[PDB]
Amino acid sequence: VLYVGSKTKEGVVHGVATVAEKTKEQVTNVGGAVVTGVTAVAQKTVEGAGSIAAATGFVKK
Amino acid sequence: VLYVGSKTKEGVVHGVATVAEKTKEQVTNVGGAVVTGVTAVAQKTVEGAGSIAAATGFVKK
Amino acid sequence: VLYVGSKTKEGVVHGVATVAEKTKEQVTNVGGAVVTGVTAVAQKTVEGAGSIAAATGFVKK
Amino acid sequence: VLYVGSKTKEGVVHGVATVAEKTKEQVTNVGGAVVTGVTAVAQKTVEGAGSIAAATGFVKK
Amino acid sequence: VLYVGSKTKEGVVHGVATVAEKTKEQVTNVGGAVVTGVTAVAQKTVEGAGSIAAATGFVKK
Amino acid sequence: VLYVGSKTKEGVVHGVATVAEKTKEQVTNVGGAVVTGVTAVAQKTVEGAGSIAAATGFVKK
Ligand SMILES: CNc1ccc(-c2nc3ccc(O)cc3s2)cc1
Ligand SMILES: CNc1ccc(-c2nc3ccc(O)cc3s2)cc1
């Protein structure tokens, strides 16, 4: 009943240096799902299902 | 009843240096799921199922 | 009833230097699930099933 | 007598990512020479003395 | 007499990722020479004395 | 008389990832020479004396 947050950090990314020399990149998706190339990403959920880089499947019923 | 957080860190990424020299990258997905290339990612969930880089399957019923 | 966190760290990644010289990368997925290339990732869950890099299977019913 | 340069590179800097988090920087020079903080610098001389970051001395005669 | 350069590289820096978290930096020079903090520097001289980060002395005669 | 350079490299630095977490840095020079902190530096000289990070002395005559 006296919660005290201070200087806290949650789902935090900082201080990222990145060099990506690539002569070629290619995704050849044929009918499917694909997720590629996530970098320096931060989420924070409450009462929820939190996905960052999901390759979810073809739901059939 | 007197919770005290201070300078805490949770799901935190920091101080990442990355060099990626690649002459070729390729994902040739044919009908499937794929997740590739996650870097410096941070999540934090509460009352939820948290996935970062899932390759989930084709749900059939 | 007098919880005290201080300078704590949970699901934390820091101070990562990475060099990846690769002349070729390739994922040739045909109908399946794949997860590749996770680096410097941090999660924190509460009351939830937390997966980082799962290759989950084709749920059939 | 048939010099052929092609795609040559000389005194070349490229592809530099830099993060510098600093809570304090200070140079307290009292009567002297100082050089600090050179980053991503490129020179090319011909028939000359080329210095990049010199701390040269008090010439007296 | 048929010199052929091609795709040559000389005094070349490339693909540098750098993270520098520092709570304090300080140079307290009192009467002297100092050189500090050179990063990703490239030179190329011909018929000349080439110094990069010299701390040269007090020439007296 | 048929010199052929090709894809040569000389005085070359590439693919350097560096993380430097330092709570304090300090150079307290009193009357002297100092060189500190050289990183990813490349030189190339011809008919010349090439120094990179010299701490040269007080020339007296
Ligand atoms: C959003 N959903 C949620 C539910 C519950 C919580 C927490 N329950 C407790 C119990 C004891 C304790 O020392 C800390 C905590 S935090 C946090 C979030
Ligand atoms: C500007 N000052 C200068 C003087 C001389 C030169 C060179 N002399 C030679 C001799 C033979 C050889 O195979 C290459 C070279 S390059 C380059 C520059």
Contacts 24+ apart (CB under 8 A), F57-60: F57/E57, F57/F33, F58/D57, F58/E57, F58/E58, F58/E59, F58/E60, F58/F33, F59/D57, F59/E57, F59/E58, F59/E59, F59/E60, F60/E60
Q: B2 CB under 6 A from ligand 1? A: no
Resolution of the experimental model, in Å, one decimal: 2.8
CA distance A50 to A48: 6
Q: Which residues of E touch D48 (CB under 8 A)?
A: 45, 47-48
Measure C47 CA to ligand 1 centroid, in angstroms.
9
Flag whether residue B53 sits within 8 Å of chain E, measured between CB atoms: no
**Alpha carbon distance D16, F54 (integer Å):** 25
Across-strand partners of A19?
A: B19
Q: How far does CA B53 lie from the centroid of its chain? A: 5
Beta-carbon contacts of D16 under 8 Å, excluding residues fewer than 6 positions away, are A19, D39, D40, E13, E14, E16, E17, E18, E40
Tokens matching residue B30: 């044919």
Q: Which structural technique was applied?
A: cryo-EM
Which residue's CA is the closest to the ligand 2 atom numbered 18? Answer: E46
- Specify the DSSP class assigned to residue A35: E
Max Cα distance, chain B (Å): 57
Cβ of residue F16 lying under 6 Å from some atom of ligand 2: no
B17 contacts in E (CB within 8 Å)? 17-19
Is F35 exposed, middle or buried (CB count within 10 Å of its CB: 0-12, 13-18, 19+)? buried
- Residues pairing with D30 in the sheet: E30
Q: Which chains touch A (3 or more CB pairs under 8 A)?
A: B, C, D, E
> Which member of F33, F44, F59 has the closest CB to residue D55?
F33
Question: Residue B5 C-alpha to ligand 1 middle, in angstroms?
Answer: 13
Amino acid at residue number E59: V
Q: How far is D24 from chain A (nearest CA, A)?
A: 17
| Distance from the alpha carbon of residue F42 to the mean position of ligand 2, in angstroms | 20
Calculate the alpha carbon distances from C41 to B12, B16, B44, E38 in Å: 8, 11, 12, 32
Look-up: residue for tokens 């009918």? A31
